[PDB]
Every structure is written in C-alpha cells, then in structure tokens.
CSV table of C-alpha atoms and ligand atoms in Angstrom, one decimal:
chain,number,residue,atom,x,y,z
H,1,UNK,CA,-4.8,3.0,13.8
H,2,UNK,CA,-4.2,5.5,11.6
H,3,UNK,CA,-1.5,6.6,9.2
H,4,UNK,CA,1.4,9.9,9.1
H,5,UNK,CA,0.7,10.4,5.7
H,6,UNK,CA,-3.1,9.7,6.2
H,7,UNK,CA,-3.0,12.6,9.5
H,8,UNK,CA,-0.7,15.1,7.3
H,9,UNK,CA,-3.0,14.6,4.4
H,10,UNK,CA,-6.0,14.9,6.3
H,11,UNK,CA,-4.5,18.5,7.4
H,12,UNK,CA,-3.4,19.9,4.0
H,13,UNK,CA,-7.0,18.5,2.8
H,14,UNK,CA,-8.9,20.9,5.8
H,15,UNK,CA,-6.2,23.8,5.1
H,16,UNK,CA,-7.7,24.0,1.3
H,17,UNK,CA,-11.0,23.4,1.7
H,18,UNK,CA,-10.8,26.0,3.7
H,19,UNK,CA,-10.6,28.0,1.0
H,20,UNK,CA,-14.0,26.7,-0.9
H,21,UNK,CA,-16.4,27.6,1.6
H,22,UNK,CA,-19.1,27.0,-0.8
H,23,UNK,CA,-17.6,23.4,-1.7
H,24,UNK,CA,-17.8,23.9,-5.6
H,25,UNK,CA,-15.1,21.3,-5.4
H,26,UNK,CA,-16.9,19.0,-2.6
H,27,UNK,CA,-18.1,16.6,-4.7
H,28,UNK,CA,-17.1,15.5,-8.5
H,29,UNK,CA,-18.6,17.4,-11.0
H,30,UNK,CA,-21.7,16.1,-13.2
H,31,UNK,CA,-23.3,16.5,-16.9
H,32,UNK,CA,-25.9,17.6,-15.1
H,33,UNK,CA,-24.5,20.5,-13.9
H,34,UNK,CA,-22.0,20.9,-16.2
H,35,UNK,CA,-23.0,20.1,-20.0
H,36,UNK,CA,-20.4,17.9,-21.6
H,37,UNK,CA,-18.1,17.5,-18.7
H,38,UNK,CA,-17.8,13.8,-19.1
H,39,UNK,CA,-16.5,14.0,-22.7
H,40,UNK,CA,-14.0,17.5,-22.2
H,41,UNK,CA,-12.4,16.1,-18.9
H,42,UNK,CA,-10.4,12.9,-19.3
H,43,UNK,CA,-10.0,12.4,-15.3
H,44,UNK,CA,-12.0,14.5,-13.3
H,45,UNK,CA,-11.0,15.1,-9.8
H,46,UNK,CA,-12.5,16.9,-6.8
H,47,UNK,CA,-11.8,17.4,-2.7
H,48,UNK,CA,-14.6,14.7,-2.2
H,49,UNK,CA,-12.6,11.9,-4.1
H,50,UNK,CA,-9.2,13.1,-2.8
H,51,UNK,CA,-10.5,12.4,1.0
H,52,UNK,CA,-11.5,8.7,0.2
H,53,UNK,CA,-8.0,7.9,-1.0
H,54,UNK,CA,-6.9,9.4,1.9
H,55,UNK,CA,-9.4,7.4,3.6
H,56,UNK,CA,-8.4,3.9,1.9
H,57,UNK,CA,-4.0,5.0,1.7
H,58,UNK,CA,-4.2,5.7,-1.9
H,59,UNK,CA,-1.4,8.5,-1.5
H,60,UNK,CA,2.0,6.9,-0.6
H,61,UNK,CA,3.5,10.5,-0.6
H,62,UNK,CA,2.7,14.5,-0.6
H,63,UNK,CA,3.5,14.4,-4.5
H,64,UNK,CA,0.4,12.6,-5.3
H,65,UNK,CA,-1.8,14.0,-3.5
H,66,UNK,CA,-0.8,17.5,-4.8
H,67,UNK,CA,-0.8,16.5,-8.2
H,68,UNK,CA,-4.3,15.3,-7.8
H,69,UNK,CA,-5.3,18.5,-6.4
H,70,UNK,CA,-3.4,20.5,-9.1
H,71,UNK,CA,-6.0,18.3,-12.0
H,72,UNK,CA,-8.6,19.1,-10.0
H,73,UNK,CA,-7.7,22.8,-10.5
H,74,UNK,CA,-6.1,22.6,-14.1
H,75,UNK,CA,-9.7,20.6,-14.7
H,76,UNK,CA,-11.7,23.9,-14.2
H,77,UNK,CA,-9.5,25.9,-15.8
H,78,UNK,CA,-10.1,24.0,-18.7
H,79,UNK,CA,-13.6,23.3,-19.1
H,80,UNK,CA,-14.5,27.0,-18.0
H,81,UNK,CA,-14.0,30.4,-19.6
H,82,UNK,CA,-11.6,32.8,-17.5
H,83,UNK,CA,-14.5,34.9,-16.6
H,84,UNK,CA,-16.0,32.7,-14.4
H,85,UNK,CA,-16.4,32.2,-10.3
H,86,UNK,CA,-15.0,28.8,-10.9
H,87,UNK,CA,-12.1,29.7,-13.1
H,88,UNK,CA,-11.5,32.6,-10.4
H,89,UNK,CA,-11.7,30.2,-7.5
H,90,UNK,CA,-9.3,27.0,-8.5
H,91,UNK,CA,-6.8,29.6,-9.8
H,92,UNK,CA,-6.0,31.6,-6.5
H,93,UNK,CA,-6.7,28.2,-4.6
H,94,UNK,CA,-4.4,26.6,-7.1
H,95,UNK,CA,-1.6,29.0,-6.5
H,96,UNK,CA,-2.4,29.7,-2.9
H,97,UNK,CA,-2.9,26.3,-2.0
H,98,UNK,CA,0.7,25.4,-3.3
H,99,UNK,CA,2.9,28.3,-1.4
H,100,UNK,CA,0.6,27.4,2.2
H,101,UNK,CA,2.1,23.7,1.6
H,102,UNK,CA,5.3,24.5,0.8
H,103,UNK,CA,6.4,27.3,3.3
H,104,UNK,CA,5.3,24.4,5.7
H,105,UNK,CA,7.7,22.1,5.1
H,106,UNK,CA,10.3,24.5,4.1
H,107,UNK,CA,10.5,26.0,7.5
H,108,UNK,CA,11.9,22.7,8.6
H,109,UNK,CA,14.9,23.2,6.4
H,110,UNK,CA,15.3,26.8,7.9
H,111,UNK,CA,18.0,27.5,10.7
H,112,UNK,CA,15.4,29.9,12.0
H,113,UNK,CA,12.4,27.7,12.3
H,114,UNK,CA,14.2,24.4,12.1
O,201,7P7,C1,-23.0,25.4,-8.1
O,201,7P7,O1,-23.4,24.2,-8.7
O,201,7P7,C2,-22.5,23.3,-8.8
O,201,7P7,C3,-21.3,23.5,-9.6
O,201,7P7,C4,-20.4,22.6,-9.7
O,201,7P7,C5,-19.2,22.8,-10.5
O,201,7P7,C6,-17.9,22.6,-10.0
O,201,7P7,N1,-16.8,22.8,-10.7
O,201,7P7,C7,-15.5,22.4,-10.1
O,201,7P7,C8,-16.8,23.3,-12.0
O,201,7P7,O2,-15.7,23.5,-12.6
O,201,7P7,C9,-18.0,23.7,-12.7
O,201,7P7,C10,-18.3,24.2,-14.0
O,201,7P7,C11,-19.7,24.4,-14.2
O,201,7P7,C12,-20.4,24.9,-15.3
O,201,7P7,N2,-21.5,24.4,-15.8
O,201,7P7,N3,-19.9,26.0,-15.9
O,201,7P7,C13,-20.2,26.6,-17.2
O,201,7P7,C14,-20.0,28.1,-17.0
O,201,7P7,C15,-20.2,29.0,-18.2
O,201,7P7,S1,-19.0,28.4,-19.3
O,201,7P7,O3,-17.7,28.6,-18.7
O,201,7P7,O4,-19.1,29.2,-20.5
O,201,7P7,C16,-19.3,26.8,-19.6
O,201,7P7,C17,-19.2,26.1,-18.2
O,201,7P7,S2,-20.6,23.9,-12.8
O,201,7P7,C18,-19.3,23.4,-11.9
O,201,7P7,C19,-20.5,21.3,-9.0
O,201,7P7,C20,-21.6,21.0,-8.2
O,201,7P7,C21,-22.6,22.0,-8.1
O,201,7P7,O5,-23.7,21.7,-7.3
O,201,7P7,C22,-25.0,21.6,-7.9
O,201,7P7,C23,-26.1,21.7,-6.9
O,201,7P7,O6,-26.8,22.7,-6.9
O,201,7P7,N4,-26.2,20.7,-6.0
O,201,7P7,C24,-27.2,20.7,-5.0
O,201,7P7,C25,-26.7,20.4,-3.6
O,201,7P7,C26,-27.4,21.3,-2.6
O,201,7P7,C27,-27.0,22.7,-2.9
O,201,7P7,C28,-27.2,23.6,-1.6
O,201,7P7,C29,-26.5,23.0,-0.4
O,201,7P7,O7,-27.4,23.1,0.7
O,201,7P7,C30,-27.2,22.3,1.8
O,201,7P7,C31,-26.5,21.1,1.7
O,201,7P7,C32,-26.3,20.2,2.8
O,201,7P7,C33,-26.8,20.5,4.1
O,201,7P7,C34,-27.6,21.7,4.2
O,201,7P7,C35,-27.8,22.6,3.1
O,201,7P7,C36,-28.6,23.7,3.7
O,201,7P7,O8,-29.0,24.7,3.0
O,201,7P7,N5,-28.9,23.5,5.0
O,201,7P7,C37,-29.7,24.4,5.9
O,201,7P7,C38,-31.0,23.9,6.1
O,201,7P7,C39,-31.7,24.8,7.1
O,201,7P7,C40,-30.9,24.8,8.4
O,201,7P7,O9,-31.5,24.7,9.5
O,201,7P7,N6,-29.6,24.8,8.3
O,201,7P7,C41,-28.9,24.7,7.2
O,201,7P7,O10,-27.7,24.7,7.1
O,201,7P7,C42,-28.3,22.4,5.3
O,201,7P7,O11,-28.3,21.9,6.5
C-alpha cells in the first residue's frame, strides 16, 4: 500500500543518512544540547522529521523533500562556527548529498544510461 514518491524518498532518505553514521541529524535538535537553538533557528529540520512526512505523504515531489534537507543543512551552518564537526559534516553532506541525487536521475536523460 505504499506510495512511488514515498519508496523513492524512502531511498534518497537511506542514501544520506548513510552519510551521518553517528546520526547528529537523527533526531531534531534541542536547547539542551544546543544553547539558544530555539530562538536562532526559525524552522528547524532534521532526517528524523523528514522520515515522518515521508511516512504520512507530506512530500508531493523530490523538490520538497530536498529543500527540507538543504534547511536542515543551511540550519547548522548557521547556528555553528565553521570550525566545527557539525559545520564540517552538513557541508560535504549538503553538497555530496545533492550531486548523488542528481546524477541519478540525470542518467535517465542520457543516451548512454537511458
Ligand atoms: C552529540 O550531541 C548531539 C548533538 C546534536 C546537534 C545536532 N546538530 C545538527 C547541530 O547542528 C548541533 C549544534 C550543537 C552545539 N551545541 N554546537 C555548539 C558548538 C560550538 S559553537 O559553534 O561555538 C556553538 C554551537 S549540538 C548539535 C543533536 C543531538 C545530540 O545528541 C545528544 C545526546 O547525547 N543524546 C543522547 C542519546 C544517546 C547518545 C548515545 C547513543 O547510544 C545509543 C543509542 C541507541 C541505542 C544504543 C546506543 C548504544 O550505545 N548501544 C549499545 C549498548 C550496548 C550494546 O550491546 N550494543 C549497543 O549498540 C545501543 O544499543
């Protein structure tokens, strides 16, 4: 009973993750963890969240479920200093996370790969 966007979401969502083995972006962040948080990001976003509106077909396309994982990353780039593992982290996942997406569904464009 599921969904194609839900079962090609639920793949880019594994692909990524992948690449947080520690899950610094499992769950959504806390004050408690993360002194003013709450008041310095305006809509916080994490992996954890992104799976339940996967979950309950919040994403009616690939747009925006990368743009919610592009906040997520532009989030800890914001509240952290450059110098940091998570500053490090969300900017090659960011990035990398983008091209692994799109050289997927390019290759279906390609006369090679088509
Ligand atoms: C690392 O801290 C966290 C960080 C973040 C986070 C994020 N982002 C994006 C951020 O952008 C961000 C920014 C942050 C911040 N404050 N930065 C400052 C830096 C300096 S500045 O830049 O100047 C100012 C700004 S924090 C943060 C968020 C949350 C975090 O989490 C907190 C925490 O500590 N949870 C506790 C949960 C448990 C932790 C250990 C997990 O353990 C488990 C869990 C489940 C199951 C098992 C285990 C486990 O061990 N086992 C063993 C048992 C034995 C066995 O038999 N087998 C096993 O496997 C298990 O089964």
């Amino acid at each position: 009973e599921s969904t194609p966007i839900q079962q090609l979401l639920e793949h880019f969502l594994r692909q990524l993750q992948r690449k947080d083995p520690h899950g610094f972006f499992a769950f959504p962040v806390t004050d408690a963890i993360a002194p003013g948080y709450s008041m310095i990001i305006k809509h916080p976003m994490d992996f954890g969240t992104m799976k339940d509106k996967i979950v309950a077909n919040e994403y009616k396309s690939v747009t925006e479920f990368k743009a919610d994982f592009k906040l997520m990353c532009d989030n800890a780039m914001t509240y952290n200093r450059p110098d940091t593992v998570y500053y490090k982290l969300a900017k090659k996942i960011l990035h990398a996370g983008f091209k692994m997406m799109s050289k997927q569904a390019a290759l279906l464009g390609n006369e090679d790969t088509a």
